[PDB]
């Protein structure tokens, strides 16, 4: 559609972040194995329903 429906080209996209969450797989080994993946197991067995995705792990 015409009349200024397209915008300016922004350098900030999402696909550059999309694959950067794909490298939020098992790679964070400083903090018994992948610790945020360890919390993923204590939800699937149905006892607690709140994950915590902090900024410390970022």
């Amino acid at each position: 559609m015409s009349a200024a429906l397209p915008s300016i080209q922004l350098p900030v996209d999402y696909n550059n972040l999309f694959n950067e969450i794909t490298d939020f797989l098992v790679t964070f080994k400083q903090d018994k194995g992948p610790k945020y993946m360890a919390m993923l197991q204590k939800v699937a067995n149905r006892e607690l329903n709140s994950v915590i995705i902090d900024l410390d792990d970022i």
Partner: protein, 594 residues
């Protein structure tokens, strides 16, 4: 466009010399704001164009701004904002105007409306007493096709561009642009702005006595919100503007105005007839006269230039007006640090004289007249629905009293229902109310000044000095000074009076208001063991002499006896609680009690 655009471009080469002195200013204000934001571990876009740089050498361009202010201001913005990037583009918000100056006879007092200049530049002054809500508003939202990864762009126009009556977009949010992609919107890159209306009354002294005060209203923007406390001598300037469809949007339209007066303006200023910047000269002279050891007495006599004597009263007013501090207790209730004096006297003895001229030098302390409807310290839950779904606890009379002074009259000529309100606001700094809504503890630093009259004429001497008004002692115990003005008749006393009233039908004031408002910004000593040793001896002898004589005094009277001397050192402008302050504090109570 060539005709409507040509004198734009000829101005576009013209006004660039009219910011030879501002093209430095407009970039210096941002380069550090660009710097500090990169090293945190803030100012809006204000470009004050004076009259002088646009009247000395342009005349055709001049009077267009004061006749038709609708084809010129968005020219001036668009040619402004390129200079923001042409100066600053290397590091990786429209900069609208303010236009300060004079005007040459457009001080329309809004009791008068115009037939000449509608839709023009208007200068308006007065007081505001409405202070409506705050609410954001969209101007431009950006959409994003999450499939194919492509973005979009959309701007909404409204009755906020101030000048051009564009075709409105009667829409809130669109969905499904010409594709099969579910539209997503990025709200971090969508821009907002606020919107606040305020009604302005008439300055009720220069409007002549044939009418009540009138009012109009003004829509401002973010740059000067929360600047307008209710009770300020404000002075705004903006465009005059009508909006709304009158006569067609409903049919038959009989006796319904459809042309609302609005002001879409800029750049308010408080005035004074808080900001008083003084030079090195006057700030040094006030220290030079501070070196004199008499200036506490000179200020007493240079206050009320009409009335003889009462130097015990005259020093008290300047002692009260300047104010004593309250040091809040850490994890504890702070005490009374307010001071609250009282008067009473047999009539026509200047009890109400000095009460009205404290309001002229008040330094933003607007008082009431003591008419005691419920509203003296409360809200009474007045909301007026605030555009269908907003309830507001509208501030009655304590938002003006904060860090200021008030005065009310006729205590015994009141009902019961005000007296219960003055109980709460004296024992406690705050009121808290839940009428049909929200419990809210809003804070208040007030200091009353009283004026009542005795009941049975001249019956003070032949009866008890106490109970002489017999209003409840809930307030007398919460007050300290009960000055009883005498009116004794002596042939040299009244003869001296008779000429002094006669000589006035035909050390300065603005220096005085500077001295106190400079002395509210100096440090507070509180600390000398010498001065605290003498006053408690000074208490104990009258602690033997209060109970076997006139009036019993209490422990809170000691908190006066620090507080008067504490402010008395604030007159001295020093950080050492001396000895000499403790002698005037004792001697002032000795006349107040004997």
């Amino acid at each position: 466009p060539d005709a409507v655009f040509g004198d734009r471009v000829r101005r576009f080469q013209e006004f660039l010399d009219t910011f030879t002195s501002y093209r430095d200013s407009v970039r210096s204000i941002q380069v550090y704001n660009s710097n500090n934001a990169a090293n945190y571990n803030i100012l809006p876009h204000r470009i004050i164009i004076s009259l002088d740089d646009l009247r000395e050498f342009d005349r055709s361009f001049w009077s267009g701004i004061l006749v038709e202010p609708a084809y010129f201001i968005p020219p001036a913005e668009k040619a402004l904002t390129d200079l923001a990037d042409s100066m600053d583009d290397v590091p990786h918000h429209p900069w609208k105007l303010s236009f300060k100056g004079s005007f040459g006879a457009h001080a329309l007092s809004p009791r008068t409306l115009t037939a000449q200049h509608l839709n023009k530049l208007v200068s308006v002054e007065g007081i505001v007493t409405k202070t409506s809500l705050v609410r954001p508003k969209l101007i431009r939202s950006v959409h994003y096709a999450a499939k194919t990864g492509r973005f979009h762009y959309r701007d909404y126009t409204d009755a906020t561009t101030t000048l051009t009556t564009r075709i409105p977009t009667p829409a809130i949010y669109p969905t499904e642009d010409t594709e099969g992609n579910k539209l997503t919107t990025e709200y971090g890159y969508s821009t907002f702005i606020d919107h606040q209306r305020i009604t302005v009354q008439e300055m009720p002294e220069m409007a002549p006595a044939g009418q009540l005060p009138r009012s109009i209203d003004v829509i401002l923007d973010d740059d000067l919100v929360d600047k307008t406390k209710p009770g300020d001598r404000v002075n705004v300037v903006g465009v005059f503007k009508s909006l709304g469809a009158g006569g067609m949007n409903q049919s038959n339209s009989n006796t319904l105005i459809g042309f609302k007066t609005l002001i879409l303006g800029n750049t308010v200023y408080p005035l004074h007839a808080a900001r008083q910047m003084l030079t090195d000269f006057d700030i040094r002279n006030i220290n030079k006269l501070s070196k004199k050891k008499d200036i506490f007495d000179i200020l007493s006599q240079s206050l009320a230039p009409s009335i003889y004597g009462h130097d015990h009263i005259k020093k008290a007013i300047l002692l009260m007006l300047m104010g004593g501090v309250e040091k809040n207790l850490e994890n504890g209730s702070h005490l009374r640090g307010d001071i609250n004096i009282l008067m009473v006297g047999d009539p026509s003895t200047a009890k109400s004289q000095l009460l009205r001229f404290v309001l002229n030098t008040a330094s933003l302390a607007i008082a009431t007249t003591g008419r005691g409807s419920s509203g003296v310290g409360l809200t009474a839950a007045v909301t007026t629905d605030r555009e269908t779904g907003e309830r507001r606890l509208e501030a009655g009379a304590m938002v003006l009293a904060d860090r200021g002074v008030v005065c009310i009259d006729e205590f015994d000529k009141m009902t019961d229902v005000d007296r219960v309100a003055i109980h709460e606001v004296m024992e406690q700094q705050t009121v808290t109310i839940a009428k049909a809504g929200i419990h809210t503890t809003l804070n208040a630093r007030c200091s009353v000044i009283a004026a009542a009259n005795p009941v049975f004429g001249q019956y003070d001497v032949n009866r008890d000095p106490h109970q002489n008004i017999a209003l409840p002692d809930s307030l007398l115990s919460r007050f300290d000074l009960l000055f009883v003005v005498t009116d004794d008749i002596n042939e040299i006393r009244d003869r001296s009076i008779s000429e002094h009233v006669l000589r006035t039908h035909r050390v300065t004031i603005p220096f005085l208001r500077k001295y106190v408002q400079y002395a509210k910004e100096r440090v507070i000593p509180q600390l000398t063991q010498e001065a605290i040793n003498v006053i408690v001896k000074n208490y104990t002898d009258l602690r033997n002499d209060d109970n076997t004589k006139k009036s019993p005094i209490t422990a809170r009277t000691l908190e006066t006896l620090i507080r008067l001397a504490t402010a008395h050192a604030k007159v001295r402008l020093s950080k050492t609680v001396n000895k000499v302050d403790a002698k005037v504090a004792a001697n002032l109570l000795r006349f107040a009690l004997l």
